[PDB]
RNA sequence: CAGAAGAAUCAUCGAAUCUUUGAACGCACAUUGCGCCUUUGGGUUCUACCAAAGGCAUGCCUGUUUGAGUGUCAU
RNA sequence: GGACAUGGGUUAGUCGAUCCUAAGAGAUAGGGAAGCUCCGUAUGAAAGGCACGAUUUUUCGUGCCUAUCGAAAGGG
RNA sequence: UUGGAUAUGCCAUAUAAAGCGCUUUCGAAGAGUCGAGUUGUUUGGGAAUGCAGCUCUAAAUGGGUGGUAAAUUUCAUCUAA
RNA sequence: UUGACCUCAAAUCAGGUAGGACUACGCGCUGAACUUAAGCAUAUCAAUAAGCGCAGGAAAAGAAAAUAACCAUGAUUCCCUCAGUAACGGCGAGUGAAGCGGGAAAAGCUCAAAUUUGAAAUCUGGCAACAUUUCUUUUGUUGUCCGAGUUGUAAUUUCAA
């Protein structure tokens, strides 16, 4: 992120199209509030729930929420695997909302 | 590989204990030696019994610091008067001050040393 | 009498010899007082005592200023070199962090400050 | 005072065992050996081992507690702990698939300098020159062996550079004195600043790893030796005022009027050194055609040890060979039977060996 | 009184000293009691003895380091 | 004159204290209590050691097992 | 020594931010907490004024309060945890 | 098997913080009896003394889950008034407020519950640079690493909207 900001900052200093030099990011979505909001907004395409969220109330409603909203969801093993995907120690839930055409 | 326990006791494991590496010294300046020879030896004693010990026992009698011990008195006498004692006896007087009997060697004359100090 | 200004413009080692010579002089004077001395000697006892105090003051200030120079522009410095106003003053919020504000309050003060106004008769 | 308890002072105080030194320094056996390689710390046995073991009799290697106390304030120990932290951070990055930060960690890998260790171990550069023969032997030994998993290619390159710079220094200063051929290899004897240095250089052959020695022992020795020679050669080149490191790829006039030519059957690596070590002119693939007038290799070496050229007929191709000599090699009844009651004074041990 | 000669038992006060203690902090204490750590130094004396300096309380907070777990997994 | 005044006077490796434990005090672990504080003394504590190794994937492995205070008549 | 102004100097990316105005719109608002019973203790609070313990435990134009308890229906007011 | 994470430990680890005193006035807890009732048990003394905890230069309270029943007022505190009143009380001895109104002083606001999601935009610390000072004693800035943080740190919103 720092490199991209530096590169685009040099682009602005050289007075070129900074808004079009970059491309829309394609990445997994994370964060409990962010993922829950995406599921309610029907933007989530796939939901992966950590199996051992220590306060279980944080995810206990998610299977019922995903079922009502018609969002495909899975309970995957361990919080740390989801964390290492998003470069964290922990991730309660991950969400896939958009992918590339080869991965459709 | 499950570790075999042969004691039925779990004893706290030994972990690294780093030594102190302060970012700053708590005291900026180290104090000087609080008990040096000029503070160790206060005054000589020139009472009649003190003179008697000087002229017969080859012994010098000094008013010394309370915190001074036999070792520090010997080092103070050696460094202040260049005469090495062979024996030191100390007592706390009823007035609260410490008094040291310093027996010099046969190499040294207590009468002469008393003369150089000036109180004789 | 030893005067502090020429005491200050000397070196630490030189002042060490002066201090040791003064201590030996005080010891000789005390021996003179207990063997019978004149008022001149007994007055020199207090003069020597103050001269020793002046020298020791000069050593300590030279040592402390050297420590201040060594620790200048250091985040952590010795406690005795730090400020000592009161314990509460050292524990209080600094004026920088007393004046810290949210961007919400910065916008409010930027756009709608307390205005200088007056009323006509 | 009260009764003092035994084993509290004397040998039991100034000597320390290896295991208690480990616990005193909070170091592992490998790390403790490492600093003992880097510093000068070796076992020292007490005259009364039983008393210094507080009455115990089990065999024990002893160090001075003064030496172990000195190792408490060694900055290299903190560098060992820093690398252990670095290794786990790198391992964590590899386990999490953080390749970019792993590269960043490798770039910022902590290393330590041996400048203070060299200065403390050899306070005088004369002492450094005295204790250099073992470093030379190790560097020249490892310069010929193939690079494997244990031995680093960059380390081999550093050994090549240090050996080349030293050899060229000997060439310029004409410091070489003797060269002997043993079955083990070639023993060179040089003289610099009065100090004599002997080192063995093996033949350039296709050897194999013995798979019995510990290269980590040699890795610390190599790292210590490489630092030592880097500083020593740096001083020497500054002393004679020439650039360090040099960019060169590789009876002062004994062989001055000789244009020697080298064929493809002789050890050029050693022959070039020894001939140019005395100022001879060397060409590689003509007065003498070396091939094993036609002379043998020992003729040149017997010439340099004797200081004058030898006789060709003795060392003609296919002739007899005199034994190769090493220049390093250099009333009675009553007198013998007078051992009155003396016990320990009886010193017939010397008469029985010498 | 003696006594000397920027004085002063002067005022002010932003630099220092501040013994043993005391919340009192190495452990104690009707015992100048009993310890340990690091560095430095001493001398007819040097593997001994001694001295000096700087340290060693508990709870908690942030961080670091070293760990433990038939705790959850990955592999 | 044990009064008043002026000075002087108590010298330890070996005599005691210090060391040890006694009845008993008393921290710590913990648990009570609005709290002052109470209880508790190896307890529902991760309560510390010692030894071996060509240096082990130059990121340590393999073994083995209770404070303190309190006696100038106690112990030494 | 400090204070608020004043003279200019320099640094400051408004590529920002903000008030105002209309929405056919929407508007998340704090739980063993409110409330109820009960037992103490409090108050001038009397069919409990506050607080506390125990038991039971909400709700969504819902919940408080309007100094006589109850059910019911309106009206004001306010928006606790 | 190595690893990741969680939980729980250790260190004379790096840097901090707490106690004690003071207590006239502040906020609480705990809590009597003498006394009065011409006895005395509810009551009164008194939500006091003693006890205990925790603050400040003031504290506490404070921007309505407030009054009122008006043509309506408008955070809190204090003063005067309400008022020895409504009310409580072996309705005995006794106790006993509040709204209004006049004045002193006035000042308002901050989060939680929102997807930044085309971008954790946030922050402690280590290091190094500068700068600054009631001050070599003070207080920051910028860069760079390590961490914290998605089990939620900034920006935006607080019902008056």
UniProtKB/Swiss-Prot annotation, chain A:
Subcellular location(s) per record: Cytoplasm
Cystine pairs: none
Free-text function comment from the UniProt entry: Component of the ribosome, a large ribonucleoprotein complex responsible for the synthesis of proteins in the cell. The small ribosomal subunit (SSU) binds messenger RNAs (mRNAs) and translates the encoded message by selecting cognate aminoacyl-transfer RNA (tRNA) molecules. The large subunit (LSU) contains the ribosomal catalytic site termed the peptidyl transferase center (PTC), which catalyzes the formation of peptide bonds, thereby polymerizing the amino acids delivered by tRNAs into a polypeptide chain.
Family of this protein: Belongs to the eukaryotic ribosomal protein eL8 family.
Subunit structure: Component of the large ribosomal subunit (LSU). Mature yeast ribosomes consist of a small (40S) and a large (60S) subunit. The 40S small subunit contains 1 molecule of ribosomal RNA (18S rRNA) and at least 33 different proteins. The large 60S subunit contains 3 rRNA molecules (25S, 5.8S and 5S rRNA) and at least 46 different proteins.
Protein name, as recorded: Large ribosomal subunit protein eL8
Species of provenance: Schizosaccharomyces pombe (strain 972 / ATCC 24843)
Swiss-Prot record, chain B:
GO molecular function, one term: rRNA binding
Cellular component aspect of the GO annotation: cytosol; cytosolic large ribosomal subunit; preribosome
GO biological process: cytoplasmic translation; cytosolic large ribosomal subunit assembly
Phosphoserine modifications at: 47, 49
UniProt keywords, alphabetically: Cytoplasm, Phosphoprotein, Ribonucleoprotein, Ribosomal protein, RNA-binding, rRNA-binding
Gene3D superfamilies named among the record's database cross-references: 3.30.70.330
Annotated TM spans: none
Domain of life: Eukaryota
Family of this protein: Belongs to the universal ribosomal protein uL23 family.
Subunit record text: Component of the large ribosomal subunit (LSU). Mature yeast ribosomes consist of a small (40S) and a large (60S) subunit. The 40S small subunit contains 1 molecule of ribosomal RNA (18S rRNA) and at least 33 different proteins. The large 60S subunit contains 3 rRNA molecules (25S, 5.8S and 5S rRNA) and at least 46 different proteins. uL23 is associated with the polypeptide exit tunnel.
Additional facts recorded: There are 2 genes for uL23 in S.pombe.
Role according to the record: This protein binds to a specific region on the 26S rRNA.
Listed name of the protein: Large ribosomal subunit protein uL23A
Organism: Schizosaccharomyces pombe (strain 972 / ATCC 24843)
From Swiss-Prot, chain C:
UniProt modified residues of type Phosphoserine: 11
Gene Ontology biological process: cytoplasmic translation; maturation of LSU-rRNA from tricistronic rRNA transcript (SSU-rRNA, 5.8S rRNA, LSU-rRNA)
SUPFAM superfamilies with a match to the protein in the record: Ribosomal protein L29 (L29p)
Record has Signal as a keyword: no
Subcellular localization: Cytoplasm; Nucleus, Nucleolus
CDD domains for this protein: Ribosomal_L29_HIP
Gene Ontology CC terms, in alphabetical order: cytosol; cytosolic large ribosomal subunit; nucleolus; preribosome
Function recorded in the entry: Component of the ribosome, a large ribonucleoprotein complex responsible for the synthesis of proteins in the cell. The small ribosomal subunit (SSU) binds messenger RNAs (mRNAs) and translates the encoded message by selecting cognate aminoacyl-transfer RNA (tRNA) molecules. The large subunit (LSU) contains the ribosomal catalytic site termed the peptidyl transferase center (PTC), which catalyzes the formation of peptide bonds, thereby polymerizing the amino acids delivered by tRNAs into a polypeptide chain.
Main location (coarse class): cytoplasm
UniProt cross-references to InterPro entries, sorted A to Z: Ribosomal_uL29 (IPR001854), Ribosomal_uL29_CS (IPR018254), Ribosomal_uL29_euk (IPR045059), Ribosomal_uL29_sf (IPR036049)
HAMAP family per record: Ribosomal_uL29
GO molecular function terms listed in the Swiss-Prot or TrEMBL record: mRNA binding; structural constituent of ribosome
Family designation: Belongs to the universal ribosomal protein uL29 family.
Gene3D superfamilies: 1.10.287.310, 6.10.250.3450
Keywords attached to this entry: Cytoplasm, Nucleus, Phosphoprotein, Ribonucleoprotein, Ribosomal protein
Name of this protein: Large ribosomal subunit protein uL29
PANTHER family membership: 60S RIBOSOMAL PROTEIN L35, LARGE RIBOSOMAL SUBUNIT PROTEIN UL29-RELATED
Curated annotation (Swiss-Prot), chain D:
Source taxonomy: Eukaryota, Fungi, Dikarya, Ascomycota, Taphrinomycotina
BRCT domain span: 251-317
UniProt cross-references to PROSITE patterns, sorted A to Z: BRCT
Protein name: Pescadillo homolog
Subcellular location: Nucleus, Nucleoplasm; Nucleus, Nucleolus
Function: Component of the NOP7 complex, which is required for maturation of the 25S and 5.8S ribosomal RNAs and formation of the 60S ribosome.
Family: Belongs to the pescadillo family.
Nucleus as UniProt keyword: yes
Keyword annotations: Coiled coil, Nucleus, Ribosome biogenesis, rRNA processing
One biological process term in Gene Ontology: assembly of large subunit precursor of preribosome
Cellular component aspect of the GO annotation: nucleolus; nucleoplasm; nucleus; PeBoW complex; preribosome; preribosome, large subunit precursor
InterPro entries assigned to the protein according to its UniProt record, in alphabetical order: BRCT_dom, BRCT_dom_sf, PES
Source species of the chain: Schizosaccharomyces pombe (strain 972 / ATCC 24843) (Fission yeast)
One Pfam family, short name: Pescadillo_N
PANTHER family in alphabetical order: PESCADILLO - RELATED, PESCADILLO HOMOLOG
Top-rank taxon: Eukaryota
Gene this protein is translated from: ppp1
GO terms of molecular function: ribonucleoprotein complex binding; RNA binding
Keyword field contains Nucleus: yes
Subunit note: Component of the NOP7 complex, composed of erb1/SPBC4F6.13c, ppp1/SPBC19F5.05c and ytm1/SPAC890.04c. Within the NOP7 complex erb1/SPBC4F6.13c appears to interact directly with ppp1/SPBC19F5.05c and ytm1/SPAC890.04c. The NOP7 complex also associates with the 66S pre-ribosome.
SUPFAM superfamilies in UniProt: BRCT domain
HAMAP family cross-referenced by the UniProt entry: Pescadillo (MF_03028)
């Amino acid at each position: 992120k720092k490199q991209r900001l530096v590169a685009e900052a040099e682009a602005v200093a050289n007075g070129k199209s900074a808004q079009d030099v970059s491309k829309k990011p394609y990445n997994v979505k994370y964060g409990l509030n962010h993922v829950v909001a995406l599921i309610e907004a029907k933007k989530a395409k796939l939901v992966l729930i950590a199996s051992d969220v220590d306060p279980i109330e944080l995810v206990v409603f998610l299977p019922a929420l995903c079922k009502k909203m018609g969002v495909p969801y899975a309970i995957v093993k361990n919080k740390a695997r989801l964390g290492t995907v998003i470069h964290q120690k922990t991730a309660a839930v991950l969400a896939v909302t958009e992918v590339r055409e080869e991965d459709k | 590989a499950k570790k075999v326990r042969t004691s039925t006791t779990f004893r706290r494991p030994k972990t690294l204990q780093l030594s102190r590496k302060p970012k700053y010294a708590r005291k900026s300046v180290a104090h000087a030696p609080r008990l040096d020879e000029y503070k160790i030896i206060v005054n000589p004693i020139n009472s009649e019994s003190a003179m008697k010990k000087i002229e017969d026992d080859n012994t010098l009698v000094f008013h010394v610091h309370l915190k001074a011990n036999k070792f520090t008195i010997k080092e103070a006498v050696r460094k202040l008067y260049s005469v090495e004692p062979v024996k030191i006896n100390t007592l706390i007087r009823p007035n609260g001050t410490k008094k040291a009997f310093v027996k010099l060697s046969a190499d040294a004359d207590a009468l002469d040393v008393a003369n150089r100090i000036g109180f004789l | 009498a030893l005067k502090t200004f020429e005491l200050r413009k000397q070196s630490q080692e030189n002042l060490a010899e002066q201090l040791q010579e003064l201590r030996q002089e005080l010891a000789s004077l005390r021996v003179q007082k207990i063997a019978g001395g004149s008022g001149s000697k007994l007055s020199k006892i207090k003069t020597t005592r103050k001269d020793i105090a002046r020298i020791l003051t000069v050593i300590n200030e030279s040592n402390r200023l050297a420590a201040r120079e060594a620790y200048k522009n250091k985040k952590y410095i010795p406690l005795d070199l730090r400020q000592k106003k009161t314990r509460a003053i050292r524990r209080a919020l600094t004026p920088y962090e007393q004046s810290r504000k949210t961007l919400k309050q910065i916008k409010k003060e930027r756009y709608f400050p307390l205005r200088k106004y007056a009323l006509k008769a | 005072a009260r009764v003092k308890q035994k084993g509290k002072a004397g040998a039991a105080r100034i000597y320390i065992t290896r295991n208690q030194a480990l616990k005193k320094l909070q170091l592992t056996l490998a790390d403790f050996r490492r600093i003992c390689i880097l510093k000068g710390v070796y076992p020292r046995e007490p005259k009364n081992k039983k008393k210094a073991n507080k009455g115990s009799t089990a065999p024990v290697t002893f160090y001075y507690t003064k030496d172990i106390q000195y190792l408490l304030h060694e900055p290299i120990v903190q560098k060992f702990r820093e690398y252990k932290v670095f290794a786990r951070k790198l391992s964590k990055a590899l386990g999490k698939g953080e390749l970019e930060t792993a590269k960043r960690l490798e770039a910022r890998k902590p290393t330590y300098s041996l400048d203070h260790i060299i200065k403390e171990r050899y306070p005088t550069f004369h002492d450094a020159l005295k204790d250099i023969d073992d470093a030379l032997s190790m560097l020249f030994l490892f310069s010929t062996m193939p690079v494997t998993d244990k031995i680093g290619a960059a380390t081999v390159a550093n050994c090549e550079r240090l050996c080349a710079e030293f050899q060229h220094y000997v060439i310029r200063s004409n410091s070489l004195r003797k060269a002997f051929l043993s079955i083990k290899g070639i023993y060179y004897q040089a003289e610099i600043f009065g100090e004599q240095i002997t080192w063995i250089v093996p033949y350039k052959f296709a050897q194999s790893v013995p798979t019995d020695v510990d290269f980590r022992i040699m890795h610390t020795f190599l790292e210590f030796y490489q630092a030592l020679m880097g500083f020593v050669n740096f001083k020497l080149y500054n002393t004679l005022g020439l650039r360090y490191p040099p960019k060169i790829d590789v009876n002062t006039s004994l062989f001055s009027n000789f244009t020697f030519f080298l064929s493809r059957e002789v050890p050029r690596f050693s022959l070039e050194f020894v001939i140019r070590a005395f100022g001879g002119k060397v060409g590689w693939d003509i007065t003498h055609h070396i091939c094993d007038i036609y002379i043998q290799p020992q003729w040149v070496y017997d010439s340099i040890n004797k200081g004058i050229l030898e006789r060709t007929d003795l060392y003609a191709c296919g002739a007899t060979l005199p034994p190769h000599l090493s220049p390093f090699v250099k009333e009675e009844k009553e007198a013998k039977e007078l051992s009155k009651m003396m016990m320990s004074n009886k010193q017939r041990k010397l008469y029985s060996k010498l």
